[PDB]
Design a protein around this ligand. Structure first.
Ligand SMILES: C[C@H](CCC(=O)NCCC[N+](C)(C)C[C@H](O)CS(=O)(=O)O)[C@H]1CC[C@H]2[C@@H]3[C@H](O)C[C@@H]4C[C@H](O)CC[C@]4(C)[C@H]3C[C@H](O)[C@]12C
Ligand SMILES: [Mg+2]
Ligand SMILES: [Mg+2]
Ligand SMILES: [Mg+2]
Ligand SMILES: [Zn+2]
Lengths: 292, 341, 463, 228, 94, 226
């Protein structure tokens, strides 16, 4: 379970820390594992991503945690839900385990609402994992968002609902293998998680509080905070990762610029103004060309 | 002196020097030890009057297929604070070499929807298909990869990319709750008014080649008959298709082509890290067979299923060569090399 | 395929005239299209057949360069002394084969002019050229086909757009019909007319029939309205795709299975063009994981089977010309039909797999043709035997087989028969044992790497 | 008659970077016959100038940073590839530009020292940002040539610590041509050709068109001597 | 495809016999420096080099072209093995 | 380091076919030169063709004549393969006369001779007659370029005349090929091969020379602005 760190790009290291393995001491064996342990259970909904897995001898044995899921003190994965009382959806959010979830009727997040009240007369819901059609008065809980069903890598694929599951497995896995580029740019069409991935990877540099930038350089940045202390941030330049890719930080501010709390100071690898940038945007024609 | 040009006085390569395969990174001598010079080498050294030395070359050189620019050198010595060297080790030297890699034939590209492939052809700008305004495309993708894989997300991404190319804007569409075709088609209507409205102001009408393509478009049921050429061109635009010219001939493609903007990533697997070859090299201790692996300069494995293929062909002499002359027949492999030279 | 397919117009499509000049007058008035099927006096023709008459292929292709006609338009051409009614594209295809083989008379007999060139027709062309010309001329023909196929696919204009996945109008009506019948079933169950299992089985049957209706509606819509649709053309020509995958793109996804093997009562009613819901996507993921696990956990069994076959047949070699035996086997041409309790003729492919390239043990007299003993059976001979069986003249064929061969440590040339990779008698010294093991093992491993997990490979391993 | 009269040539220009050229009337099919070869020649075979090597004081290679400078050497070289230099002397083949700046300032292409028969077409191009206490002393070499030559091919180094730079010599930026449906008398199938050329300003569109026509003319003389 | 491959396969009863005949003939040509060839001066295979057009160094190519002419005799138990080599050396010193 | 001037070689066999090779060339110049020449060769080379035919007792093109195997359609098709060369540059249009009595096999040599008119293929088969068969035919030959359908020109010299498609172009077919070649350390060079088919009135080499001159003349139009 102690593994050489994967840091081809900032997203590669974020995924490696969220992986769940059934192997190791006290676990299963790759050769003696049956079909039951490698299958998608109905209780994986909102807790384990159903698509992100390696095809081959490790299929169904190494998985990923869902985006909104969290592990409790006893070690059980929980997912959030919205309380529904009297046909109106509230802002109270409850985290619950799989055994507690089986006692309620939980509606889908795409249920039409007029403000906070359910408008549709027929509601699609789940009862112990099975899809049913119920009236609004029988609904007790609601999904927070469609994003809680999938992991971070799968949440970065736009128009996912139009893609086959087998091909979507390749799309999310291959984003780990993208290399940083000297002119990397953010995609034209995004899903909305690009900013948070960069922020939570600790690869870029942000302002601790409001202040003014005093010194800007390719090696250091000095910021004068409002309370008066001087903080100097050394920048990592031309550093070699475990995979051999070069990791560098480029400053994004000028001398005298005023910055608020949380403002970007320097871009990390594979980032563009705080947005994840794993490639280029190019003009594409879909047509055969002379057998090439 | 040519081989020692880039080394400093301490025997290490200077920072900023360009290194190629066979170049020396750091020089090192070893004591040769005791041995009986062959009788032939005895006469050879006596004729030239050259007294032998007690040391030999054991320096570190660039492996084949590598090289670049020296950027850093690290030196650790015994007794330094925090340096815990193994017993018997005096010092250790580390050298860092950096290279800038451009795209080439054999590199792997992919998008977020699972479409992947290698680069097989790089074309000059005048050979690529271009828009009527003269703008060439960058990447050409085969439509045969879509129907069997059932990944239609790349098609919708291309359509939204085309509208944003002319409107100069980006979009955020959350999964399962985002942009739909009625919303995409209304953005394409605004993009057409700047893609085609600009042409009218400059004083240009409809191309002769565009008229020919529109004539076939209604035969395929793509446009409504009886409309003006401008209206029919707008109908094709709302489907994500434009008239495309061939750079080699100047004639249009006989059918409208889907053109748009897509996000493509460059993958870690590169051909420059995978190509390897070997004629002769290191051998194993017990079996006396060639080692394996590019890092060890090893040979390729001829397994059981490969032997079955030669047997089915009836190539008896080809099979016997790989079993003996090229793997572990020591007398045969020494004689084979001397015969060829 | 693109240049060999002809256009079909529907503007006129039925108008009748009296003289060809009358039909041509209406064409210039915009009433009838060039390829619209019309009747002049008694015969059905088109304007293009009468308006454009070409003396030779050079004139027809020259007019295409000047833009008067397209490759897909049907016209009249004079070629090899015949006043054919074909498109310039099909005339162009005939010239490709003639120049590749450098013989106009033989190449004319090798091709099928009046059909578009699909995967099946191109495979027959290659096999016939091998029989008549040899390896050297067949290799040259293969390169010529590759060169022109790549050239024409670039300039034709094949592309994929979101609107190319055409939704049939009948899908909305079919789904509403299913809902009315579904509600009828539930009412009957509530009144005690049927049990739980009976209700569950009826629901599955209703959705199975509805899915097949949608598949027919998808392809019927393409044929009548969009014959040149990129998805339709790819499946019809055999380039890419099958009807099952086309339905998921344009119709509905269909029923899905639980991890336990049971099927969900509610199917996925949306296609990939419309987009799935979160609940539908999760339900469909159970079967995707199951297919991936079967691929990974069953490639070793297929590979293990191949190794067993090699170790049991590795010593079988063609060691002599003839063993001198008089034993043989009889290959049946008819099989019992247990469902109807009668004898019916076998499939043509099954008969070919047991008779092609085999030495006749005894003399056979069929349809006035004498097949002597010791004659290798070509593909034409097999076809003649099938025709004779359809006339009730023969029921079985005596042939020499390795089962009855008397050669020690192998087989003889006369008992083995043909070298299937060369369409000629097998040469002495070939390791036919290794070839047999590789031939059996290859399809099993390839299929499981892409049914075969059912009583397929497990059934074969048991046998 | 069947032999059409000589077409009239019309030129419309916008400064030194854009131009339009019209040739009408033409016989049917000659718009593509003439327009396409000119576009292919214009986009590939027009000589120009480019930066081929740069030397910066106290810098050993391009994978380093300069104290007091916001940008690193890689970003500086990218900015230098957008520099446009015009040679006023046809016999001139190579020139060297010198820059010496001290912070705090934002250096532009106009901070280069003047050289005779050399003109900078984009003086407002941004090169680097200097912080207080920063210095920038560098020498840039500009050559003349054709096509696209990678730095790995020429490998030009004026001294020990010079850094070779990939060269894009083409001054032409974009070429497009239009074919319209014109008529003359009773003939309605005639062609009208319009050529649109975009350049960087060192070479005007009219000059580039003349050079492309001459290149095509000299190639047609190669069909003269049969060597059977 | 090799030139004349269809005609070469029709000259032998077994396809593996053709390979043996070609391989042994190629060894004979290399042993005697192509001085024992049955080809005419205008029939010798040639390769294009920068300096000029020279003889083909590939002996397998020579052997295949010699077999198509029909001036070679092949079979089993033709001549004693020792008598063959000694006679060839005396006729073609090398 | 500009490229050396290429070598132009010709392989001409007969009077109707020829091959021309030009190498070495800069990258992409094979397409640059090959495409314009093919377009000019197929549409701009001057020639002669039959534009109208008059046949006695024939009302329409789709009818048949008693006493001859070939119908009106087949006779018209045979006329479109006739090759005629005008010796006099001033001469523009001629009319040929044909009168035959059965059961002879009518050939192209049976036409009445005309001053400054030469028949290139006198062995061409026109029609086959039987006993009691008559064939009184008049054809009109014009000058032009390219290919013009009958419905376009609509030329009739008299009542009941049948216009026929005019195949003016003497060039039958053009096909060019571009191959990758090398010269020392340069590996991106181009080699161009041009193949031309002609009806025999003009040599394939003559057609190539005319096509080059036509393109050269058009390049001089970019001379006097406004
Ligand atoms: C008919 C003509 C010769 C007629 C004559 O000599 N008189 C021969 C000689 C050169 C031949 C072409 C080239 O091989 C390139 C290419 C090879 C592909 O395989 C098939 C297509 C191509 C275009 C060929 C077609 C045809 O075969 C050509 C035109
Ligand atoms: Mg793997
Ligand atoms: Mg007609
Ligand atoms: Mg420039
Ligand atoms: Zn036998």
């Amino acid at each position: 379970l102690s593994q050489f760190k994967d840091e081809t790009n900032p997203l590669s290291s974020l995924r490696h820390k969220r992986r769940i393995s059934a192997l190791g001491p006290g676990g299963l064996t790759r050769e003696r594992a049956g079909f039951d342990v490698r299958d998608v259970h109905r209780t994986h909904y909102g807790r384990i991503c159903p698509v992100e897995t390696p095809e081959g001898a490790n299929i169904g044995l190494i998985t990923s945690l869902a985006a909104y899921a969290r592990v409790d003190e006893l070690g059980f994965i929980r997912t959030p839900y919205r309380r529904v009382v009297g046909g109106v959806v509230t802002d109270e959010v409850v985290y619950m385990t799989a055994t507690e979830e089986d006692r309620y009727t939980i509606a889908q997040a795409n249920t039409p609402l007029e403000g906070n009240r359910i408008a549709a007369e027929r509601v699609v819901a789940r009862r112990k994992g099975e899809p049913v059609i119920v009236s609004p008065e029988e609904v007790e809980f609601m999904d927070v968002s469609p994003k809680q069903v999938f992991s971070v890598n799968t949440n970065l694929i736009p128009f996912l609902e139009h893609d086959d599951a087998n091909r979507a497995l390749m799309g999310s896995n291959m984003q780990t293998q993208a290399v940083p580029l000297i002119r990397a740019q953010a995609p034209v069409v995004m899903t909305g998680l690009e900013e948070r991935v960069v922020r939570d990877s600790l690869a870029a540099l942000y302002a601790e509080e409001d202040g003014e930038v005093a010194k800007v350089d390719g090696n250091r940045i000095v910021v004068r905070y409002e309370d008066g202390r001087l903080v100097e941030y050394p920048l990592r330049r031309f550093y070699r990762s475990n995979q051999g890719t070069a990791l560098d930080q480029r400053p994004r501010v000028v001398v005298g610029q005023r910055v608020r709390k949380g403002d970007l100071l320097a871009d990390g690898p594979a980032s563009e103004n705080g947005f994840l940038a794993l490639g280029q945007n190019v003009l594409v024609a879909i047509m055969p060309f002379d057998g090439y | 002196e040519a081989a020692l040009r880039d080394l400093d006085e301490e025997g290490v390569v200077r920072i900023g020097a360009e290194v190629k395969p066979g170049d020396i990174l750091v020089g090192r001598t070893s004591f040769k030890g005791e041995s009986e010079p062959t009788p032939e080498e005895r006469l050879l050294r006596s004729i030239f009057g050259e007294k032998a030395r007690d040391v030999k070359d054991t320096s570190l050189r660039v492996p084949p297929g590598e090289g670049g620019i020296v950027v850093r050198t690290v030196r650790l010595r015994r007794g330094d604070p925090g340096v815990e060297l193994k017993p018997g080790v005096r010092e250790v030297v580390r050298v860092y070499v950096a290279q800038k890699r451009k795209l080439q034939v054999g590199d792997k590209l992919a998008n977020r929807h699972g479409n992947k492939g290698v680069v097989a052809k790089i074309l000059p700008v005048e050979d690529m298909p271009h828009l009527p305004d003269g703008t060439p495309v960058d990447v050409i993708l085969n439509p045969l990869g879509v129907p069997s894989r059932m990944n239609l997300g790349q098609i919708l991404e291309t359509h939204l990319g085309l509208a944003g190319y002319f409107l100069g804007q980006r979009y955020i569409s959350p999964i399962f709750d985002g942009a739909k075709e009625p919303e995409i088609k209304e953005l394409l209507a605004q993009a057409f008014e700047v893609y085609f409205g600009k042409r009218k102001g400059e004083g240009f009408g409809v191309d002769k080649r565009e008229v020919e393509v529109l004539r076939r478009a209604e035969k395929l049921g793509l446009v409504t008959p009886g409309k003006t050429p401008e209206e029919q061109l707008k109908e094709l635009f709302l489907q994500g298709k434009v008239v495309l010219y061939d750079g080699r001939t100047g004639e249009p493609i006989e059918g409208p082509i889907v053109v748009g903007q897509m996000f493509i990533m460059k993958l870690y697997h590169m051909v420059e890290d995978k190509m390897h070859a070997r004629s002769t090299g290191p051998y194993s201790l017990i079996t006396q067979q060639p080692l394996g692996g590019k890092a060890q300069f090893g040979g390729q494995r001829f397994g059981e299923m490969e032997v079955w293929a030669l047997e089915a062909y009836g190539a008896a002499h080809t099979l016997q060569e790989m079993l003996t002359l090229k793997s572990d027949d020591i007398e045969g492999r020494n004689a084979a090399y001397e015969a060829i030279i | 395929y693109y240049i060999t397919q002809v256009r079909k117009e529907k503007k006129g499509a039925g108008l009748e005239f009296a003289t060809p000049e009358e039909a041509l007058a209406a064409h210039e008035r915009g009433e009838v299209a060039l390829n619209a099927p019309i009747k002049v006096a008694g015969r059905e023709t088109s304007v293009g057949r009468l308006k454009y008459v070409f003396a030779n292929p050079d004139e027809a292709l020259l007019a295409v360069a000047h833009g008067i006609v397209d490759l897909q338009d049907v016209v009249t051409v004079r070629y090899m002394g015949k006043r054919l009614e074909t498109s310039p594209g099909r005339i162009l295809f005939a010239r490709i084969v003639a120049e590749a083989v450098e013989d106009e008379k033989v190449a004319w007999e090798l091709i099928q002019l009046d059909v578009p060139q699909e995967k099946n027709s191109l495979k027959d062309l290659v096999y016939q050229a091998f029989l008549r010309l040899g390896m050297e001329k067949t290799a040259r023909l293969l390169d010529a086909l590759k060169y022109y196929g790549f050239t024409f696919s670039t300039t034709s204009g094949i592309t994929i757009g979101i609107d190319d996945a055409v939704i049939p109008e009948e899908k909305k009506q079919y789904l509403e019909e299913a809902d009315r019948k579904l509600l009828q079933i539930e009412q009957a169950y509530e009144m005690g007319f049927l049990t739980d299992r009976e209700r569950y089985d009826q629901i599955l049957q209703l959705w199975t029939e509805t899915t097949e209706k949608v598949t027919q509606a998808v392809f019927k819509n393409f044929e009548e309205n969009y014959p040149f649709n990129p998805l339709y053309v790819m499946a019809q020509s055999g380039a890419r795709g099958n009807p099952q995958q086309i339905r998921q793109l344009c119709g509905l996804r269909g029923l899905m299975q639980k991890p336990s093997g049971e099927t969900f009562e509610v199917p996925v009613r949306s296609s990939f063009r419309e987009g799935l819901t979160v609940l539908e996507y999760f339900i469909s993921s159970h079967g995707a994981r199951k297919g991936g696990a079967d691929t990974a956990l069953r490639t070793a069994d297929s590979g293990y089977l191949t190794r067993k076959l090699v170790d049991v047949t590795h010593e079988i070699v063609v060691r002599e010309a003839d063993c001198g035996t008089t034993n043989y086997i009889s290959v049946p041409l008819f099989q019992p039909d247990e469902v109807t309790r009668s004898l019916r003729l076998r499939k043509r492919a099954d008969i070919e797999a047991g008779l092609y390239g085999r030495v006749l043990a005894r003399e056979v007299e069929v349809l006035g043709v004498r097949l002597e003993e010791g004659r290798y059976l070509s593909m034409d001979d097999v076809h003649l035997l099938i025709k004779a069986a359809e006339a009730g003249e023969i029921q079985e064929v005596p042939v020499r087989s390795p089962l009855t061969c008397q050669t020690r440590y192998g087989v003889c040339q006369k008992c083995y028969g043909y070298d299937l990779s060369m369409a000629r008698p097998v040469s002495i010294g070939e390791a036919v044992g290794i070839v047999a093991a590789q031939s059996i093992g290859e399809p099993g491993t390839q299929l499981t790497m892409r049914a075969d997990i059912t009583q397929g490979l497990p059934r074969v391993i048991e046998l | 008659d069947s032999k059409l009269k000589a077409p009239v040539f019309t030129v419309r220009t916008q400064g030194r970077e854009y131009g339009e050229f019209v040739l009408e009337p033409l016989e049917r099919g000659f718009g593509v016959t003439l327009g396409n070869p000119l576009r292919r020649i214009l986009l590939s075979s027009i000589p120009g100038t480019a930066v081929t090597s740069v030397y910066i004081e106290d810098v050993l290679h391009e994978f380093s940073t300069i104290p007091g400078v916001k940008e690193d050497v890689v970003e500086i070289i990218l900015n230098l590839k957008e520099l446009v230099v015009r040679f006023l002397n046809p016999s001139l083949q190579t020139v060297t530009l010198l820059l010496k700046a001290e912070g705090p300032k934002e250096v532009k292409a106009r901070d280069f020292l003047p050289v005779a028969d050399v003109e900078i077409m984009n003086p407002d191009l941004h090169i680097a940002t200097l912080e207080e206490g920063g210095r920038l002393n560098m020498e840039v070499r500009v050559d003349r040539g054709v096509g696209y030559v990678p730095a790995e091919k020429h490998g030009i180094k004026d001294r020990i610590n010079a850094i070779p730079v990939d060269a894009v010599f083409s001054p032409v930026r974009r070429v497009a041509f239009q074919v319209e449906d014109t008529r003359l008398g009773q003939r309605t199938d005639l062609d009208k050709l319009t050529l649109r050329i975009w350049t960087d300003g060192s070479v005007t569109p009219l000059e580039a068109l003349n050079q492309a026509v001459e290149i095509l003319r000299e190639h047609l003389t190669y069909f003269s001597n049969p060597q059977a | 495809a090799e030139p004349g491959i269809d005609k070469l396969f029709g000259m032998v009863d077994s396809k593996y016999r053709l390979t043996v005949v070609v391989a042994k003939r190629a060894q004979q040509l290399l042993r005697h420096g192509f001085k024992n060839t049955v080809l005419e001066p205008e029939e010798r295979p040639k390769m294009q080099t920068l300096e000029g057009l020279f003889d083909d160094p590939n002996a397998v190519t020579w052997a295949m072209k010699e077999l198509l002419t029909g001036r070679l005799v092949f079979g089993e138990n033709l001549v004693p093995e020792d008598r063959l080599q000694k006679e060839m050396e005396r006729l073609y010193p090398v």
